[model samples]
Target: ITLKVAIYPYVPDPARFQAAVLDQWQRQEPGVKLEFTDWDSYSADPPDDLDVFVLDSIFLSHFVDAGYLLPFGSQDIDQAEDVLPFALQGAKRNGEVYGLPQILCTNLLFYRKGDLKIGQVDNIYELYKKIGTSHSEQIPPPQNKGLLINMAGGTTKASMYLEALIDVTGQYTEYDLLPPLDPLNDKVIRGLRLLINMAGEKPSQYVPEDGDAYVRASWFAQGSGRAFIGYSESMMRMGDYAEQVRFKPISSSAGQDIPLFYSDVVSVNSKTAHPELAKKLANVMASADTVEQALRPQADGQYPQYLLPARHQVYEALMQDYPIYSELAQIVNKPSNRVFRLGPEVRTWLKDAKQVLPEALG
Candidate 1:
């Protein structure tokens, strides 16, 4: 049996894939041959014979709606008991599990400790002002652009808009259907105003060239920016620079705290020839020991941690290894009405926003 699996190229790479999962699975089931494909291949035109694939939880509904994925059963349900509550919930639809969550991804405040006490900042407005003021005082000349905001376009801008909306309104615009959002409505207008203010007169001063996470991470790591919005893995990837910084909540308008949420999930392909094996593979890929190995620092001295595991045990282990994980876990446990995930309606909204938001910010 040849098991075909698709995964994000940057993460779950051939080396980590072999070390974390394939090594064990190959030993257990020597007869089954495992084949892997990067996400681009699957997205381009997935073969009908593809066995299992990893997907962002936000797209789970899109694929499920398109009948690209198969439903899970009692065996998968038994596995769900170990998954974090939010992750397990995101993996389900119509009261049935459809995917096994593999990794947790979210953006949080990453800032230099000397710049501002980000953890103590109560609101987004004040935090930005502090960053601006502090940067002016410290970096001296030319390169003093504080608060590295990546609101140029694409996912970064859309995520910023969504987080603001939830921060102001205390609720998320449903991704299941087109939200009845009036651009002129107070809630939306306030959110848009926040974005515009954050971008400032010269948007380039704050916005990165490509508005991608890595670019912003580089700026933050190099001391080009005092604060940045980055993922949980940012610290590990940033090396020594990360040691001087910390993770905190991205504040909401009403002084409430909200952090964005994104996740990677594994699902069995509906057209797979080996349904049972695919299910087993999904579970094995997301198992506790496998995740720990994937996240652990490697001897090759490559990227330290590419993905944050979705299980509580992995989170617990990370808390012990990294003190910042304690704060991250606290924010993760906090109740926020604005947790954003992707879906078809969100896809449409983001598409339209990409065109309109750049101009609106300008």
Candidate 2:
């Protein structure tokens, strides 16, 4: 009875997940053979033999629509009360929950604690005026770059582009997530123009020279940029610099301050060989205990991964022991924190965006 599983690959620490979730699965079902699959962040294809796997909720509709996922029965979700509403809802398609939400991520505005001015700004567009044009001494060690974003293009650029559209139009009616747009339309033009200018006066320097600090989180941690746009786990990436940092939601689209969050969800393969065990593994993976264990500090002085938890209880427990978690507790459930719900059509939209965005990166 071999039950195969995989988790999202972009976690702050892969070893911790092995020790916390995967190993626990093995220990509890010692007689049942458990095989772990490593997923490639760059690849869209998932192994056909995987019994259970994890993915971003933004992509959940795609797989479910493609018949790759199994919807959870009402009884399949453990601690239903503990799950955050937006997190759970992200896994729904036509009201059926197809995945168990695991972790939450959103683009953040990160800056030094002393730079209250930077963190307090209204949005990324505002930050552009302060640091987008020239290097600032606020950036550690001088040779400073103004701002940092992963405009590395492809899905990265497309994601950022869509974020700009949502922000600029205060959530554009239909085209916010849907694509195949009129490139010349007002919101479309504004969205592309917003990102282009934010790419900064000197766009080349904003990009990572290599993979060093490739995204805003890692880039900010390395002190190459003064203020950055990235996710919350940056505290883990910040290493010893964690205490020096503070974060805010970059900008509320349409002045609403509603954040767009990316949720990683645990889903069972519809055609899995062992449906019962596969569903069980999916439940365990999404359990609050598993999430806490997965994100908690692995060593005495080390920071917990600082990934936002999907359960209110996890926030309460982790916040007690870690200041970083305390900071996250305020963000995990921002009343209107929006789940990335772009449907299956998003992939094609992104495909077109990857080609169209560079021209507009003003």
| Best of the candidates, TM-score | 2
lDDT of 1 at 233: 70
Across 1-362, the per-residue lDDT of candidate 1 in tens digits comes to 78988754545334675566776567567789888765642234346877887776656667777778889886554456667777777677778888887777766677667655666765667666665433132221135455555454465656666656666665554367644434623554555555345434343335444534455566567767555665767666576666677776556565444555777777888899898878887877888777777777767555446356777777787677666556666666655522256555556666776676666554
Where model 2 places Cα greater than 4 Å from the true spot, the runs are: 135-145, 169-177, 184-223, 252-254
C-alpha lDDT values of all predictions:
0.63, 0.69
lDDT, candidate 2, 1-362, per-residue tens: 88887877787886787677766776677788767788752457457888888887667766877888778889877888889887776677867988888888887777777776786686655776676554332323233456665455467656655555565657533232475555534654554455445445344335455654435565566666676666777678777877778777766333755577778888887888788788888888877787889888778876688788888888888876787777678877678777766657777777776666666554
Give the Cα-based TM-score of candidate 1 against the true structure: 0.83
Pairs clashing within candidate 1: none
- Per-candidate RMSD, Å: 3.9, 3.3
Which candidate should be chosen as best, given lDDT against the real structure?
Answer: 2
All candidates' TM-scores?
Answer: 0.83, 0.87
Candidate 2: C-alpha RMSD after superposition: 3.3
RMSD (CA, angstroms), candidate 1:
3.9
